[PDB]
């Protein structure tokens, strides 16, 4: 060809094509291979020079980017990354994946990603404000509430969303849902901190409902969680609300586990204390310096929770990538684990995923461990961005109760899109649970592709 | 300096600064003094020539104005005034106050004010239409549903909102929530006539709930109302709905009071009759020409209701400015009055306000009379403007029931913002009710100020 | 209910007075309605300007743009960054711009803007940051067909640069949105020389009418004040025409030729004053050299008028209100016969009233003839219109082409003011027509008439 | 983390090198900061282009627009439809356009765009469909004050037509949004002749400086390559000036006069090569007639340089990289003293380094003098600016008016490059100043300086 070398993007494309080729989609719909060629070239890319002033009064140059990849199902939606590795290949990879994740939710959102090679590390607040102002001066003309609604990602938190929103308001002279992850007083949504964690649990509550034909739920279930950030904390609290017991949490240095995994659970106050050590970036281990905690928990330095919990029913890896091995996957299966969902991204290794799915194909219905990818089950952050834009449109804020109930419905849509897509295009044997991984890898594309066809984007 | 002389604006600024300096806000947040310098200079002022034609075919010149003061929490929101005194000083004063009132509600609304030195007095309907058309020809380019949403005020009623909306539609070729107080068939909201009056009562129903830990409500309470316009009429009807008894109403010429303040109440039919005398601009006194009314009410010419009602529990001044003196405030306290809220603006004199708050600091909890300023408790008109814009956005009209329930929730937000701000920055002694006047004077600024900071408008 | 704007109210009052004291409202009585419409600005934008100083502190200033009148063209007029700036002062300066711009004969409306921002003590980076903040809001109200601002006190080529570059980044368009631009990004030749040449061009036409062609600048002694581009190019033009330049001055004092009867500044001397002024130095520096100190007297703390001896022409080219009523009577006693301004509002009202009373009392060439700034000072504003014209043609005209159109403009301006005065302010036979009243009427009727045609009034 | 863009990175590197090897950064050290800012595009738009071929199949191509720099004007530069097109190649071509456009002295920024769409084998209807699809997205980023694209390889009058008509339908505006337009819908006279005349105009100025006016084109033997509008109008100009044209060529071979010492192509011969080229025919066809075959030798598979014998001037007017380092040393050995390009990037870097080393080793008229394309090749881009100027005037100038402004432009371009070289790349006494280094510096400092004034860097 003459095409640029884009290894991250070429790999994302190959992965999706590889999933679609392996299913029955092109056997039944051979013409959808054309959809694949079309969708894989972004509708629009803006690259732009960002000049800004540092604390020493010195001119600085960075590169700014917005990949507006697809808008068949709604306006471009997707995060901004401020990281010195950022380039078009990486944003094309992330933006391409964001199309199909947003689509998988059921919400009217396209896909996109942007950001900068700007490095937030070592920068003052004012440097971050000056760059945000310089960045949004160009970006403003390509985005807006009905066109493209960016959000946070690596190096873009509430602080940068703040500065970017202010500059947009000042340029466009308009108050609108142009960004998500806004502050609560200026168009933010309630249930945003809780979105991903709560969403993980609503997703698996849909899995438990389906697998067990309604006979079981989270009430009395033993849940092994890993990690202790946003996702782990709010997933724990939702499990407790639904009458489940969380027997573990972990940070990078070890696992905190209830000594009695038959009886006991983290309480909401124990989660608050964990939350208050994380803010002050201390180790979970530190809690067993007090007398109350030491009596109720074992701390296991350097250890993941999976082999140490005993009999468990649900596993919510919510710490990091590749945090459940093939081995500790067998250990969960052996322990009678029936539900595992990724709070984290790519949380399960290929070996762990293979073990779960091998088990799903050799065990009928409720006797299978059912695995759900993060793409599907950590989509709660995405769902609540949709609800922030919905609230912004009418400029009327919902109650926590209204936002929570809609997030649960949206997670039921993520679950049902995955289920239905598996049943059509990766049809399981009689009595076998459809593959929530294959379902979820395919569901996005088929909706985007049929929509592009209806809209004349391919024929 | 070189600044223009703006006595009304300099006074509004001094009053807010004086409230913030007297609290603990700058002791805990000294950097918010910068927010004060920034917020006090409007983001944008448009002044513009208005040329229009009178009934004699003669050219007329007036001045048109829009102060777009603040938009950190939403699009500019605030009334239009057509009055021969109008100038930039007065609109800056009103627009500045509107920022913090809208903010106090919890709704995503900035603040603004505009209008004209045009004098509606003696003008024909067609003159008012010609001026409205000439006025909106310039104003249209600076406003719109997501930018700036004006409304009514002195000299701008449904009639002028009508003409202004028509001209905007004709200029912009768009149907949108660009104005509030619209006609019911063209984007108006239900519960608009009832907004302020109903809102007054929902606010105090929140005060009664808090003060009495839920043990009391409006059911069986004796309520002294003054005035007989919109506010008094709908406040009365809401009190009756909630099982309360309204023992009084008044116009400029005297007070109509139930002869038996232990037993009796105005009924909804007696309010209809009062409403039908007001439309035909007659005096409440005139009702005691009939036999039924004379038997049930005493008319007291030239008298306010406050000393003449006996034992009363709630007082809703809803007539005019400075309509409850220091003296008639002691008389309400002595009568066991525990709740007073301003339906009217500045309804209580400084002396009355001081008496209420002196009583609040010397009496624990439910034994205090609790006073709420109009800024807080008459915000129902503002709340229903928010709900009109919400309905306009989707172009789907709510039921009276849906609008009423949301107004009650919004009034609970006005109440809670005032409470929480008092508890933080004017912390009462143990067992003392937080100051709803101080709370409500501060709550607006702290939300606008922290939002400006998040958005980079000051640092 | 109106706010008190002294400066504006004064300028409206003296314009009213010039029109009342004429045949205008006798012949066209309906034109009284136009004065009341013209006097209220079509549009005013006031805005918050938040910017960051070199210590990283948040600073807050007020931005303004007065869009006074657009009957004859897009709004046009300078920006002023000065701590005295307010709406009152900009309305006053903007009201004037309407009639100045009108008198060039080009399609330019009138306006004025700026900020109470104080350039004094500010670094180049603080100015760049303020200019970025300022244009961020201003950009949505202005444009090459809407409103084309320019420089003034505290807004030089430097600020015009930073304002242009921010307008270009935000609007993503390269257009004649601002005048006074650099030679390589839409600037005009003759732009440095425009006001100074223009006042001389105008005065040339005065001397020809007053003497029926019998005198010129040739052999005239010319007192000039100031030492900037305006005083420099006014002097170089006087010299080219055979006149003698007897004075220049800066803020700290005057530099006068010892022999004001026969002697003169040279182009070489002018070049060295300009050399000093790029280096921010005083003209006093020069009588420290022996050659200059023999030719010239330095007068600390003085303007030149009282100190030049007998003189024929005065061109105030320094600052506003630099010719008092007393200094005007001194110029009359020194035998001065022609006075027009290189500086914006150089002459006080007391000075203008002295000149006009002298003109009414002295037949023909015996009178001192004053021309108002809206006519004689319009050389820069004229070349600002030719800069717009060059930007819209996408070409840069030669210095000779710009200069040719400038000469033509200043002649049509002189002629309009004289002919208007002869029709509506008909002087006593042998009295020089009022170029004060002629120009005021000429500029007011051209605006008022176009407003009528366009339905701004009836 | 940056992507590898060889072409771009090479062009940045050789520009850096020319600036380092000079007094520029000694005199103006702060200008180093500008090189790093100028080198990153202000804006790049990449977009999907979906279109339908003659079998009704969906096709997908990549569209680009690089908006490199707009300090000096709206973005300006051609579109290329060629299957090799990518962001790297367009950045390279766009970076060059900044400095080419700057050197015309008109207000034009720089840019470049196009598509990997392959016109080869495509019908007129497929091209129309692709042009409609392409402009459908491109239109929102471009405009007569924002970005004015033009033709290049694979984008001829035909594509400019279809692009213009789609822009007009979508934007509902008739404006100078594109250059290279047809004579009846905003096109310019001299647009066919612009690049060929322009290279000759520039070379005229070279021969005059190198010989201090003692030689001209008169009696010069001129080897030309190519047979398009550029080679045709370059030849007709050389002939008008008394020069002799010894070669033309197309892709399949050269056509050389047998007697390169004394003989020449005629205007009549040029007319017939142009007759053939409208009919898509080879220049080889011509020595099948007896008259031509006696006058001329055809050389299959050859460019002319090695084959012309002794020659005085070389004008490569065919394609990029058509003068290797070897062919450059052959031109030096044949006694060639002046070389400039009619074709975009005709000379290889190896050729340019040979010419510049020869210039540094040979005093005065003994040196071969090479002029870089950004200076000598800017005739088309110049007339593109005059096409914008005509569109904004709403007039069509005569051929003589367009030609007059073109001569003036190419003279100011030559003079800027010579004077810049004499200031910052001062040659050894009797050495010809580097028009390579002079032009590079001249074009970089005009852009860098306007960027500074406008606050793009400090």
XYZ file of N, CA and C in Angstrom, chain D residues 134-202:
207
model
N -15.394 13.640 -2.106
C -14.209 14.277 -1.501
C -14.615 15.651 -0.952
N -15.291 16.462 -1.766
C -15.560 17.878 -1.420
C -16.641 17.907 -0.330
N -17.488 16.874 -0.273
C -18.611 16.808 0.681
C -18.065 16.985 2.117
N -16.944 16.370 2.456
C -16.307 16.607 3.762
C -15.348 17.788 3.661
N -14.527 17.865 2.607
C -13.487 18.908 2.574
C -14.157 20.267 2.735
N -15.377 20.485 2.185
C -15.949 21.856 2.100
C -15.952 22.517 3.481
N -16.241 21.811 4.577
C -16.398 22.488 5.902
C -15.065 23.015 6.462
N -13.921 22.711 5.846
C -12.596 23.112 6.382
C -11.933 24.187 5.511
N -12.547 24.536 4.417
C -11.861 25.377 3.387
C -12.749 26.559 3.072
N -12.224 27.534 2.331
C -12.991 28.729 1.908
C -12.094 29.870 1.473
N -12.650 30.832 0.758
C -11.866 31.881 0.038
C -11.034 32.705 1.034
N -11.358 32.647 2.320
C -10.535 33.365 3.332
C -9.794 32.414 4.279
N -9.875 31.122 4.060
C -9.479 30.091 5.071
C -8.412 29.196 4.444
N -8.751 28.592 3.310
C -7.868 27.601 2.640
C -8.354 27.464 1.203
N -7.481 27.792 0.254
C -7.766 27.809 -1.201
C -6.842 26.795 -1.852
N -7.361 25.562 -2.058
C -6.590 24.511 -2.696
C -6.500 24.805 -4.197
N -5.733 23.967 -4.880
C -5.430 24.067 -6.315
C -5.102 22.658 -6.792
N -4.664 22.590 -8.047
C -4.372 21.352 -8.785
C -2.971 20.868 -8.471
N -2.688 19.664 -8.892
C -1.368 19.022 -8.759
C -1.468 17.746 -9.591
N -0.531 16.825 -9.425
C -0.638 15.465 -10.046
C -2.023 14.849 -9.770
N -2.747 14.441 -10.808
C -4.025 13.715 -10.688
C -5.193 14.675 -10.380
N -4.945 15.986 -10.238
C -6.022 17.011 -10.047
C -5.811 18.129 -11.078
N -6.493 18.025 -12.216
C -6.343 18.958 -13.378
C -7.588 19.846 -13.422
N -7.728 20.649 -14.458
C -8.914 21.507 -14.623
C -10.165 20.681 -14.433
N -10.147 19.426 -14.914
C -11.349 18.568 -14.839
C -11.773 18.403 -13.374
N -10.892 17.934 -12.528
C -11.205 17.706 -11.103
C -11.515 19.054 -10.433
N -10.827 20.140 -10.810
C -11.066 21.468 -10.154
C -12.514 21.915 -10.413
N -12.979 21.709 -11.642
C -14.394 21.837 -12.018
C -15.300 21.069 -11.081
N -15.122 19.750 -10.951
C -16.117 18.956 -10.179
C -16.059 19.368 -8.695
N -14.858 19.674 -8.201
C -14.683 20.091 -6.784
C -15.363 21.430 -6.526
N -15.191 22.375 -7.434
C -15.781 23.732 -7.354
C -17.309 23.598 -7.338
N -17.844 22.762 -8.214
C -19.303 22.730 -8.388
C -19.935 22.134 -7.164
N -19.378 21.058 -6.630
C -19.834 20.510 -5.329
C -19.650 21.512 -4.168
N -18.534 22.202 -4.053
C -18.363 23.235 -3.000
C -19.488 24.273 -3.131
N -19.746 24.722 -4.346
C -20.781 25.749 -4.584
C -22.164 25.216 -4.170
N -22.509 23.954 -4.479
C -23.859 23.406 -4.163
C -24.015 23.354 -2.643
N -22.977 22.903 -1.934
C -23.087 22.655 -0.481
C -23.076 23.995 0.268
N -22.145 24.895 -0.050
C -21.922 26.144 0.737
C -22.877 27.229 0.244
N -23.466 27.053 -0.940
C -24.404 28.056 -1.537
C -23.654 29.395 -1.525
N -22.474 29.361 -2.100
C -21.645 30.561 -2.259
C -20.704 30.366 -3.460
N -20.508 31.445 -4.192
C -19.642 31.496 -5.385
C -18.454 32.383 -5.010
N -17.293 31.772 -4.789
C -16.101 32.457 -4.210
C -14.824 31.771 -4.695
N -13.688 32.461 -4.549
C -12.354 31.943 -4.934
C -11.853 30.889 -3.965
N -12.586 29.791 -3.871
C -12.308 28.704 -2.887
C -11.224 27.795 -3.447
N -11.098 27.755 -4.758
C -10.125 26.916 -5.489
C -9.476 27.776 -6.578
N -8.219 27.497 -6.932
C -7.558 28.177 -8.069
C -7.318 27.148 -9.162
N -6.903 27.597 -10.359
C -6.814 26.693 -11.527
C -8.182 26.495 -12.176
N -9.106 27.444 -12.006
C -10.538 27.353 -12.432
C -10.639 27.695 -13.931
N -11.717 27.305 -14.589
C -11.946 27.552 -16.027
C -12.151 29.047 -16.302
N -11.835 29.463 -17.516
C -11.773 30.883 -17.909
C -13.087 31.579 -17.674
N -14.210 30.860 -17.676
C -15.541 31.482 -17.607
C -16.076 31.467 -16.160
N -15.479 30.693 -15.232
C -15.941 30.610 -13.816
C -14.802 30.880 -12.839
N -14.187 32.054 -12.990
C -13.233 32.632 -12.042
C -11.781 32.333 -12.364
N -11.480 31.664 -13.480
C -10.108 31.351 -13.909
C -9.309 32.582 -14.263
N -7.986 32.431 -14.312
C -7.082 33.541 -14.652
C -6.422 33.292 -15.997
N -6.297 34.351 -16.776
C -5.309 34.404 -17.888
C -3.894 34.247 -17.343
N -3.015 33.695 -18.188
C -1.570 33.464 -17.894
C -1.448 32.241 -16.989
N -2.572 31.626 -16.593
C -2.546 30.460 -15.683
C -1.886 29.279 -16.397
N -2.193 28.939 -17.677
C -1.398 27.952 -18.393
C 0.102 28.275 -18.476
N 0.485 29.520 -18.774
C 1.874 30.010 -18.985
C 2.632 30.332 -17.684
N 1.950 30.385 -16.543
C 2.472 30.974 -15.277
C 3.814 30.348 -14.838
N 3.906 29.019 -14.699
C 5.119 28.351 -14.137
C 6.282 28.449 -15.138
N 6.013 28.215 -16.419
C 7.011 28.223 -17.509
C 7.559 29.611 -17.759
N 6.678 30.599 -17.881
C 7.113 32.015 -17.993
C 7.908 32.387 -16.737
N 7.384 32.031 -15.555
C 7.938 32.431 -14.245
C 9.386 31.972 -14.063
N 9.697 30.718 -14.451
C 11.066 30.134 -14.300
C 11.983 30.932 -15.212
N 11.531 31.256 -16.428
C 12.326 32.073 -17.392
C 12.532 33.488 -16.823
N 11.466 34.124 -16.318
C 11.527 35.479 -15.692
C 12.611 35.505 -14.619
N 12.533 34.566 -13.692
C 13.536 34.378 -12.618
C 14.921 34.207 -13.268
